[PDB]
Symmetry: D2
Subunit: 427 residues, 4 copies
């Protein structure tokens, strides 16, 4: 149990006895969930190891390609390793994707053509994808809508599960629909992420209407949450970011897609241009970090999830509503806390900032950010800028004052920040 | 003049006295042209220095940049430096462009929309752009044509200059034309590159028909050939590769665009996606090389060009037809030599290969890529055109295209090694 | 517990039921030791976090210095962070150290002068240090001995503890002794690493004869094994390698020293030259990885230690003699196994090679090492070449056939490797 | 000639007609001196190309080694290329040398042992070497003197030439002298740099007394000034900085030595430790820039020298004493200007900073630079910090107020900077 020396050290952070008791109770309560996670982690570590070994990765794959990067074996074998991990025909892993949204956008523009319609089946996509699609606003930035590609949407049911009957009806009534988009993570929605079994039910439902419909999954935040990925239950294409789970906290930028050879090649032509695709693109010497990040990903992903589960339990014990609960099956690393008080939300986030190794001294306050209307507060202090796998928090400043917390390179770090933050509002 | 020690050293590369006499004559003949280049180089060096200074570039700009790269001053200031050099509202310089074709394609998809038509006014664009446009064939890769964007073409007059009369006709007769594509370099052809004055006449001509038509120039190989760039004579947007002239021999990958804020932003949305544009994108630890490459570019571009000029004159003196001539105004660093003999063309390329610092020893032979191609290449940066290289499709009349040379001495050495394999 | 999917996947590596039974028993036995390690890790994570926060580390410290490296705040602050972690006046952390031996040699040549004598109090130091000192070979390479600096040695007692009485006797009789060398880790010794309390007893004993005697500790493999470091119990100077524990699996090269300002400055003059010391030395843009490595070090060190503890117990249960035993206090991450059979030793190492992500397919056979009459066999397949914190094994091919196993970026990886290896010798 | 647009652009830097006319006159006067330089540059370019080709350099040599760097072909082949360029048995080219003083000091400590005496034959060495040797001051930093290695000095003659008769007398009278140190460049003096023929005369003289005396040359700033290097006229060992000539303006840090295998090995054991030497040492991903820099060095070295010659003649015409004159044979890239006025001096250096691409707005001032007695002002607006192959100027603050100008990646840049600087003092 916690050392007396550690207790004294935490007192210098103003962590009080009431918070320590809540922590001891929460740790005791969540032990069985941690064991479930360790069983999954064990399988995923083996899965990833096997993929490296099947590709015969060697020292020589730590390339330092320049120029066109023709024949960069490090890049080509990393794609192969990912495709093995995800059990897909192909993959496309590049530092050139600037963020996860870029990878998703490349998938969409890559696989859609004028006259086609895409169908999002988990309600409204996260905000940044809205400009990519041209859902509401269009200002000639060149959205899907501006290239004659249409958008439709089926919301999740009241219970948070996909509306399979409506999905079928919408597909049957519109034969122009060639792509179904499934967001795995909840985003800022007060509901559960979709479980792998839910993604399967969706794909089976879609494929039963027209087998040729491409089932695309935004896999961000869901890597290594289960022993299966969406590609193990019928997904034709998935996309994600290398500064979230799959980079293991160390890939410095980039993104990935895994799926059928056709979907990947089509995506590659949007990443670069038709006729080039993924054949060109040197990797700036960062390929070693991308291999290593993948190898560490199953473990680091669970450190962060463990942080989320402790957060869920401890905040519940402190009297705050939380989503998800500590014992629910999770499909992402995000934890939401309803403070129901603006000041508590602000102080909690400030606490998280002070618990960061980087920029721990920085002003953490509400600010107006481009196109949000409501102010936003963000705690971030990472080794890799914008990394979601490193402890961070964000919240719109509006009723009922919900904060979203994610990451933690280690469970001990996430725990420490959580204790600092909670001590700012519970004493 | 050439030291006796150098001559004896060159003898070890089988360089003979006949080749040395041709070299001597060529050097005498091309000195006035070198002086002309030096006057341009001096101005361009100042222009680039001033762009750095106006942007107050400092050591702090050689930033460690990771993740999203939100607020990356290294990247942001480099865009501002390029905008100053080219005298444009904005610029987009990124290591994320995998090659020059990506930069050009990004400009075209970025600035065209369904129903618009683009017009290429220097005949058909270089080959790799054909799949991007969807010119001849289409296999659902997502070409401009597959997104409802149309393509038209006006060829250069038989004298190599723009057909202004036909451009006007085609524009007046098709109001759906919203962009005019101008290729500055010659490509695998046999004509002069377009001079800045020629570019200006095309722009003035086009804007006189409809002032809203975007005039886009593929500037590859043309950087620092003149004291003006196409953006100085009305181009709305230009694109290029950082492993050609503008990288100064040291930028390791990437491309650039310079132009109006609207055109540059639209391009950025194709580079990434609508709503992100150029706001995200870390620079991978290579930003210092990109800045330093720019600073050296005016100088290095002329080392390569002097190489081309010497090549032109010595091969002319050797008895071959060369394009362009040693004393013509140039708008690119490429030199063509017509061998009228397959073996002489092959040997020459093998000579260039053996004159490279990297992969000097590698077999240089024709390979399949309709006709076979042969390429001499041995560079620090893979595929760099500013480093000494040669390529030639194997077909009548056996024309080779030579370009690059980090230093004039290196280009010279390669030329003398190559010519010695055929003039004995 | 272990999923059925995991058991079937492991069956593909020829892992058998007897090995899985041994495994389940060993996991049951070691859970209390793992909890003790978690308590120490929690403290150390906080210690490192605190060191970052006190130095107000920001993204601005992730420098990309060039040339002379004058005023490189990234490098300077990293030294300050390490000094806080080790509670020393100063520290010298540089990528310029090519390995741990270099760092140790810099300390010795830095702090010794003609006529001085150094005393190693833990028996003979590991082999690579012999040429530095000039113990056996003196071929004008410029050893301490070739510079007029003498060497004396005091072996450990039969029980493996320091011979305090003999240390005093030798120090009293030889007033030229100005530095005492203490090796924390064991080497080829079938004995335990020295505990922090043992190091304290040596320092107390030495300072009580002459307070000015420099007490120097080779800290390799010992970082974060305890909540205290040798500098917390009076060591004047310590040295280590960044591709061992303290680089957290991600530092790409380099070494560190931490200690009094005088000792560190004197070391810096050997690293470079007198009058320059640590004032020049750009850091190639690898400083971020060094900071992140340190931050992950408390956690990664314990992933490796958990693999060593598992190895100890499962091998003991398999019938092999092991050093240390699963429940002894540890001062390093190394686990020794006495096979008493050349073939089993070789098969075990082959197994570890087949469980690596990198070079899993390369032949692992004994080979002739320059200047040694016993062949050596080594299993190695790392992201960072030569890293001791990634799973690896090595053995000199001699009776009684003892292998040394260390590393494991994640406990799951070390575990997988051990299971693959044991299955090659226990059916 | 200069374009009118260029003249108008220059007027925006407050460059006046008097300075432009001085420039025009100077260029006319020095043109013939440049022809000589191009003949040398041509040979040197071929010399370097040949060395690359003999070593069969390929893209495979652009290594990205990590950890120990064992078996790094990029590093090993670069040493071989250097050795061919300098016509020596061996070479040691490493990013690990922090500056040129480090490389020189490693040579001396590497090759001298207690009882040996070194003899500097060009008068007092460059400032930063005084602490390395222990000439005057000794504060237990570990100078040669503190390790029992003695120092003697023979000054140059009043005419600046080597005093061969005195060298002979000193060597004959002291058989403990085992190394002769020869400085090629003048440092902060007022004399001409030693030509290759002067270096030969010293080597022949020394070897005629005792063939076993190591002839060591500090080659900084002299690389590619002639078709020969000191190793072509009998030097056993030479050393220099990769941020001066031989780095070609792109090597980011480091040093080199070239010479006999025995002298290079002995230096390597000081750079690291005995028993390791040059066998360990990963190269931080910068090896490609070191190869590329060497290839550009013959050219860039002459761009800087053309700048020095222009500076000589334009300042002479302006009315200042200069050393050397525009038409003297040069053995380094440095140009000295005696202002005999502290104000004109600091103003000139400030002009140079304002003529630089990087940090043009920083107003440079005198500072306590590591390794110097008095305060020196340095103009150093560079891509690589402290690089003196990039346009720079430095000047100890003391009578007669001599400024030392060197560098220029292009002659056009050196020209522009000289005009900017002179315009601040001449109107
Ligand atoms: C003569 C001379 N020696 C040595 C050096 C090395 O100086 P630094 O340590 O600044 O690289 C410079 C120099 O000009």
């Amino acid at each position: 149990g916690m050392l007396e020396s550690t207790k004294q050290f935490l007192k210098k952070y103003n962590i009080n006895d009431r918070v320590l008791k809540l922590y001891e109770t929460a740790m005791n309560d969540i032990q069985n969930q941690f064991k479930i996670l360790d069983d999954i982690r064990e399988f995923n570590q083996l899965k990833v190891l096997n993929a490296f070994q099947e590709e015969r990765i060697s020292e020589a794959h730590f390339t330092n390609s320049s120029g066109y990067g023709y024949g960069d074996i490090g890049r080509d074998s990393l794609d192969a390793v990912y495709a093995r991990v995800f059990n897909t025909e192909s993959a496309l892993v590049r530092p050139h994707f600037v963020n996860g949204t870029h990878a998703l956008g490349a998938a969409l523009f890559g696989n859609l053509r004028p006259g086609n319609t895409m169908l999002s089946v988990c309600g409204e996509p996260y905000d940044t994808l809205h400009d990519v699609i041209g859902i509401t606003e269009n200002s000639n930035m060149g959205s899907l809508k501006e290239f004659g590609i249409n958008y439709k949407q089926v919301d999740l049911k009241e219970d948070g599960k996909p509306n399979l009957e409506e999905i079928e009806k919408v597909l049957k009534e519109d034969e122009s629909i060639t792509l179904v988009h499934i967001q795995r993570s909840t985003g800022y929605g007060w509901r559960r992420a979709l479980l792998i079994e839910d993604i399967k039910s969706i794909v089976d439902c879609v494929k039963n209407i027209r087998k040729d419909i491409i089932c695309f999954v935004d896999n961000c935040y869901g890597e290594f949450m289960d022993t299966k990925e969406p590609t193990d239950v019928g997904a034709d294409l998935i996309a994600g970011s290398l500064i979230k789970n799959i980079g293991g906290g160390i890939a410095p930028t980039g993104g990935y897609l895994a799926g059928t050879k056709d979907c990947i090649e089509k995506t590659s032509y949007r990443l670069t241009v038709p006729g080039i695709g993924g054949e060109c693109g040197s990797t700036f010497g960062v390929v070693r970090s991308m291999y290593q990040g993948l190898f560490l990903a199953p473990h680091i992903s669970m450190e962060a999830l463990k942080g989320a589960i402790l957060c869920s339990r401890i905040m519940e014990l402190a009297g705050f509503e939380v989503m998800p609960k500590y014992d629910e099956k999770r499909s992402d690393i995000i934890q939401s806390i309803k403070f129901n008080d603006k000041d508590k939300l602000i102080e909690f986030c400030k606490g998280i900032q002070t618990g960061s190794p980087i920029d721990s001294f920085v002003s953490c306050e509400p600010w107006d950010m481009p196109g949000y209307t409501d102010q936003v507060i963000m705690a971030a202090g990472a080794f890799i800028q914008g990394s979601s796998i490193e402890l961070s928090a964000d919240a719109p400043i509006r009723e009922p004052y919900i904060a979203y917390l994610q990451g933690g390179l280690t469970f001990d770090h996430a725990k420490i920040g959580i204790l600092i933050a909670l001590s700012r509002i519970v004493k």
